From a paper:
The 70-kDa heat shock proteins ([name]) are chaperones with central roles in processes that involve polypeptide remodeling events. [name] proteins consist of two major functional domains: an N-terminal nucleotide binding domain (NBD) with [name] activity, and a C-terminal substrate binding domain (SBD). [name] proteins bind and release client polypeptides in a cycle that is coupled to an [name] activity. We present the first crystal structures of four human [name] isoforms, those of the NBDs of [name], [name], [name] and [name].
[name]/[name] is a constitutively expressed protein with high levels in testis. [name] is essential for maturation of male gametocytes and is linked to male infertility. While it is undetectable in many tissues [name] is involved in cancer cell survival. Crystals diffracted to a resolution of between 1.8 and 2.2 Å except for the [name] crystals which diffracted to 1.3 Å. We conclude that at least HSPA1A, [name], and [name] bound ATP in the expression host, hydrolyzed their bound ATP, and subsequently during crystallization never released the products of ATP hydrolysis into solution. The overall structures of the four human [name] [name] domains that were determined here for the first time all closely resemble the structure of HSPA1A and related previously determined structures.
Residue numbers in the entry: 5 to 384
Write the structure that this text describes.
Amino acid sequence: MPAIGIDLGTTYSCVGVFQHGKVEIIANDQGNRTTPSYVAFTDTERLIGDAAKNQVAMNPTNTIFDAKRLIGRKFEDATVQSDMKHWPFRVVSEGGKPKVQVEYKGETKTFFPEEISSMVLTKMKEIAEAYLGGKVHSAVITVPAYFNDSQRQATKDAGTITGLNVLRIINEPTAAAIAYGLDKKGCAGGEKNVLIFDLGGGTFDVSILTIEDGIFEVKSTAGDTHLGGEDFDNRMVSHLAEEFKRKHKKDIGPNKRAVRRLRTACERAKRTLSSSTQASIEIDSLYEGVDFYTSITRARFEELNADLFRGTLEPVEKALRDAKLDKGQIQEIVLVGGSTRIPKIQKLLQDFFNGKELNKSINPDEAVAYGAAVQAAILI
Ligand SMILES: Nc1ncnc2c1ncn2[C@@H]1O[C@H](COP(=O)(O)OP(=O)(O)O)[C@@H](O)[C@H]1O
Ligand SMILES: [Mg+2]
């Protein structure tokens, strides 16, 4: 039985396995190679993953996400208190630790962040067991490079609750570097600087690593923990909500379900705009029985996000400054995260790096799990 690599992500999680010399990223039971890091509770059910994310429109107060923003933190931490103001679910304090509060089968229940993340890990373990047959024993789990020991330990605790032997907790950018074999490339010293540009659903991370004799050293990190694909979706939502109001004289703003359904449609369209120059929006009965069918272009999407896309270069500059490197001293640039599929992002980054080709042959939203799966097989 092989060990698995799990990317336990802020917005999505991904599981891979290394068998017969190669990594397979494992599809879940809806056929998807990534699974939303979502857990929903009702009077009769606990849903995890696609099932949870797909019903958030109908169940916003008891659908938990963003547990990674709480894990290993204290309730009174400024980051926790700030994030709470933007979540539809309730967070409370128990012994100084944050817990999410939900209604579940006739009772108010509270869960530690590591309990929620354990539910997600159990789903990833179950996906892997459906794929492999039998029971999974061991896993490498990834975390952001900036995670402190409390955050790492709480992630380990989620693994323990799930019943996994956590072989190692490794950093996300290191996992990405491992996926590209950057620790097995070259023999002479020098010119071993890699920049990992990781733009996901909720966070943006730039990391510079130097890799000598198979030893990864994190030289610098930069980014924005509140910049990701969800923010690009929201720019579309504002734009298209204005359009619906203009065309149909109805303001969907006060209706949570309508806004959520438009947001889902926008995320779908956004993904399409990474490979096509136009995308359709088709929402039956968006508001008061009125359908919203429309079209959006890649160009318009880029305009709606022009500042956010261009702004990703600032953390790159900062990471370079902190590492005491010039952009010309980066030997490899690696794209990680689903949002790095956006053509304009790729173009801005490649232009910043003076035309240098980017590493993107591994699906960017799978690269962390891929490297975790490689490392798990190595650790046996
Ligand atoms: N083809 C695509 N084009 C643009 N954005 C995408 C595409 N595929 C996925 N995304 C976005 O990637 C984000 C999720 O990033 P991912 O790296 O998979 O998860 P996480 O950030 O949780 O690690 C979401 O905002 C999603 O909409
Ligand atoms: Mg990620």
